[PDB]
Amino acid sequence: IRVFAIPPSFASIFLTKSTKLTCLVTDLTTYDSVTISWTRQNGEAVKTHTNISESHPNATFSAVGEASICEDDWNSGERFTCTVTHTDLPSPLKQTISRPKGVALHRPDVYLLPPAREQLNLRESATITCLVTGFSPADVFVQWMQRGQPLSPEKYVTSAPMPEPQAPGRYFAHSILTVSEEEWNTGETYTCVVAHEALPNRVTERTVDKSTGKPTLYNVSLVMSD
Amino acid sequence: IRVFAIPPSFASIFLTKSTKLTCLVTDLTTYDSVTISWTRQNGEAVKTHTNISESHPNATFSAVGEASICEDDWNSGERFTCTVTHTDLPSPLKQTISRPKGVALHRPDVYLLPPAREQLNLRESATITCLVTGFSPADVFVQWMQRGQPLSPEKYVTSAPMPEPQAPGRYFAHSILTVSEEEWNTGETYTCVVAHEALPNRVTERTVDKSTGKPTLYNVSLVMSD
Amino acid sequence: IRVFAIPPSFASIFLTKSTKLTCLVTDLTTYDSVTISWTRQNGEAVKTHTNISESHPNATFSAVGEASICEDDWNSGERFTCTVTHTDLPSPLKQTISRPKGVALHRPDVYLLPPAREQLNLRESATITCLVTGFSPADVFVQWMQRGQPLSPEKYVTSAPMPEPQAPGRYFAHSILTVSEEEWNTGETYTCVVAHEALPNRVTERTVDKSTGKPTLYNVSLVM
Numbered sequence: 001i002r003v004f005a006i007p008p009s010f011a012s013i014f015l016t017k018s019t020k021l022t023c024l025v026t027d028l029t030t031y032d033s034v035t036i037s038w039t040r041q042n043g044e045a046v047k048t049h050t051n052i053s054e055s056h057p058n059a060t061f062s063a064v065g066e067a068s069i070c071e072d073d074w075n076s077g078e079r080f081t082c083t084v085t086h087t088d089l090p091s092p093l094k095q096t097i098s099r100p101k102g103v104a105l106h107r108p109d110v111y112l113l114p115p116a117r118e119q120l121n122l123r124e125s126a127t128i129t130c131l132v133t134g135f136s137p138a139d140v141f142v143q144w145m146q147r148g149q150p151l152s153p154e155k156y157v158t159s160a161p162m163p164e165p166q167a168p169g170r171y172f173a174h175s176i177l178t179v180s181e182e183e184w185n186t187g188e189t190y191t192c193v194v195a196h197e198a199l200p201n202r203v204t205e206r207t208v209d210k211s212t213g214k215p216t217l218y219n220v221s222l223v224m225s226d
Numbered sequence: 227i228r229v230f231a232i233p234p235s236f237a238s239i240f241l242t243k244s245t246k247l248t249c250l251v252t253d254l255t256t257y258d259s260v261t262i263s264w265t266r267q268n269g270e271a272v273k274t275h276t277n278i279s280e281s282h283p284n285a286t287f288s289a290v291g292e293a294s295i296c297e298d299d300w301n302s303g304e305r306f307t308c309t310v311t312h313t314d315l316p317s318p319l320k321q322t323i324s325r326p327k328g329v330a331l332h333r334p335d336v337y338l339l340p341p342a343r344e345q346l347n348l349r350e351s352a353t354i355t356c357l358v359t360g361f362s363p364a365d366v367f368v369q370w371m372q373r374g375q376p377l378s379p380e381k382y383v384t385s386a387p388m389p390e391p392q393a394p395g396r397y398f399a400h401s402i403l404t405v406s407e408e409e410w411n412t413g414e415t416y417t418c419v420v421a422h423e424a425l426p427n428r429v430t431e432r433t434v435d436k437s438t439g440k441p442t443l444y445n446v447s448l449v450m451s452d
Numbered sequence: 453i454r455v456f457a458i459p460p461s462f463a464s465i466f467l468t469k470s471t472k473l474t475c476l477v478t479d480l481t482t483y484d485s486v487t488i489s490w491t492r493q494n495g496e497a498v499k500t501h502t503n504i505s506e507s508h509p510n511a512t513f514s515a516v517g518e519a520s521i522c523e524d525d526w527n528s529g530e531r532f533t534c535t536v537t538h539t540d541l542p543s544p545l546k547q548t549i550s551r552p553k554g555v556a557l558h559r560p561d562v563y564l565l566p567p568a569r570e571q572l573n574l575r576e577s578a579t580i581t582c583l584v585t586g587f588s589p590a591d592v593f594v595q596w597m598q599r600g601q602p603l604s605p606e607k608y609v610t611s612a613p614m615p616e617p618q619a620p621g622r623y624f625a626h627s628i629l630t631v632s633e634e635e636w637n638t639g640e641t642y643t644c645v646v647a648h649e650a651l652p653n654r655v656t657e658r659t660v661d662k663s664t665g666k667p668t669l670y671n672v673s674l675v676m
């Protein structure tokens with residue numbers, strides 16, 4: 001019986017606006033004799049909602065329990081222990097998780113790149129790049145919004161954090177968005193929202209527009225009619 | 227005892243300029259009774275050099291089987307076979323690897339993006355991105371050069387190919403090269419070479435320099451009547 | 453009976469992407485008693501496809517034979533031997549061929565020049581020259597491409613490498629492409645691909661057009 005209880009990820013916490021735990025238990029034969037419950041250091045019982053998934057092809061069943069806990073408990077590093085009881089287990093299987101301390105925190109620097117002109121000449125599609133670098137540790141959520149309305153999660157692809165070459169400890173990642181030529185030429189404004197723990201306000205935003213950085217042009221005419 | 231044969235990759239053959247074969251066998255109790263032999267499909271024997279690595283922490287041993295084969299035969303279609311004989315295994319284990327067929331070919335397009343103005347205003351470093359998108363299959367090699375001589379493999383980090391949601395079956399990838407602000411302000415030239423199967427010459431290059439894409443700031447129209 | 457066995461040059465290797473051998477035999481009387489077959493240094497029966505040509509006007513025949521070899525085998529340094537057997541020859545004629553060693557490597561410098569303004573003023577045609585200079589040894593392959601499409605080999609003529617008086621050992625060569633001015637005044641861009649054995653990636657490219665050379669900052673003009 002494989003009993004796993006992953007910690008709540010930062011991205012999931014920011015997306016769902018709540019703290020939910022999960023004790024994934026697999027390799028189960030009988031799903032009618034399972035019980036999943038979490039507790040604190042003192043021993044107070046925590047209301048845990050257990051759900052039963054489908055039957056795995058290897059004749060094994062899954063038991064998932066989820067509970068809602070106030071961010072303060074997890075943020076404080078309070079240890080959460082999962083309780084698993086089954087008829088095939090002579091003793092219950094329990095695991096303890098907490099927060100790893102001594103973690104470096106550096107606010108990420110966000111850079112937004114506009115589409116190359118040579119690409120626009122083909123009249124096919126434009127690509128806007130949102131670079132996020134110098135963040136610690138690897139927990140970053142990148143979201144693209146247009147005119148204050150979030151976009152669908154299909155139009156952009158977000159990479160995974162990778163170590164920086166010159167600076168150990170610093171990570172970096174970047175995502176791209178694909179838009180049609182006419183929408184870009186119309187004059188729409190796009191924004192890149194980045195969510196990180198080390199940020200003072202936890203949220204920073206960068207915007208891009210067709211008319212951004214265009215230098216002043218000069219049109220001089222001379223007659224010199226002696 | 228597990229037998230794992232790793233077929234050569236485009237980048238590996240493109241680098242060493244030769245085709246190499248790896249037949250990795252792990253979970254070996256005794257390393258003095260292992261025979262790694264490469265045999266062609268027809269029946270001819272291929273020389274294999276046996277090399278033994280260190281001892282794994284889990285009381286297991288691994289062996290490496292290396293064979294040299296002409297690159298013209300790898301894409302011909304004929305299969306290979308790595309034979310492993312050991313006292314523990316009652317019968318030898320065999321593996322079959324070849325080049326798959328049934329994948330369309332597409333020409334990657336290379337776009338070069340200069341660093342953002344905000345980063346240069348901060349005056350710390352500069353980031354050049356060599357985007358490579360619209361290709362199939364997923365074997366691409368990217369290298370950076372400046373003023374003819376190549377660059378060290380530590381100054382840039384590439385990303386594994388990822389599917390493009392807008393072009394099913396077409397992939398994309400991006401390479402980032404970090405340089406100092408002073409070197410960028412000098413007026414140096416940087417290039418990213420891309421190697422792919424579908425390219426007629428299998429080599430495509432793009433050039434970037436501080437002075438690129440600058441529009442016409444002035445427009446003087448001298449007139450006269452004489 | 454004369455037997456000629458040429459080596460596969462770099463130009464052919466790059467053009468057909470497959471190393472091929474040839475052992476031409478001339479001054480032949482009977483074509484029914486000729487057998488051409490290549491062999492390895494240690495001795496092997498290399499698959500040779502013998503072909504029969506026509507009859508020369510001087511009442512002599514000729515024969516050819518091809519044998520495919522993995523490129524690495526050739527550049528490795530192995531010497532070969534061509535086997536010729538005939539009823540009129542008491543002993544077979546064997547020739548040993550190999551590539552020379554001990555050659556300094558010089559990367560080719562590529563340059564592109566636009567047509568002269570007088571030729572355009574003539575309103576007839578144009579000629580673009582691709583200069584490949586300062587390279588050694590003398591084995592180069594120049595190809596032209598427009599709109600990412602290889603151009604008909606009847607449009608450009610290439611020159612065989614010639615020694616450079618300025619420096620000893622290095623060579624130089626160039627090719628010209630003729631295009632009418634009607635196509636030239638559309639802003640068409642032309643590419644000159646150079647293939648060599650000393651380049652890191654064996655391929656170099658250059659581009660030319662009207663916008664190449666004109667200043668980009670100011671736009672001075674006259675109205676008259």
Ligand SMILES: *[C@@H]1O[C@H](CO)[C@@H](O)[C@H](O)[C@H]1NC(C)=O
Pocket residue numbers: 219221447
């Ligand atoms: C500059 O002046 C010329 C006439 O001298 C005119 O054709 C052109 O439109 C002017 N530029 C702009 C940006 O209006």
Ligand SMILES: *[C@@H]1O[C@H](CO)[C@@H](O)[C@H](O)[C@H]1NC(C)=O
Pocket residue numbers: 445447671673
């Ligand atoms: C420069 O002036 C000419 C007329 O002299 C005009 O045709 C052109 O549009 C002008 N350039 C720009 C960028 O407006």
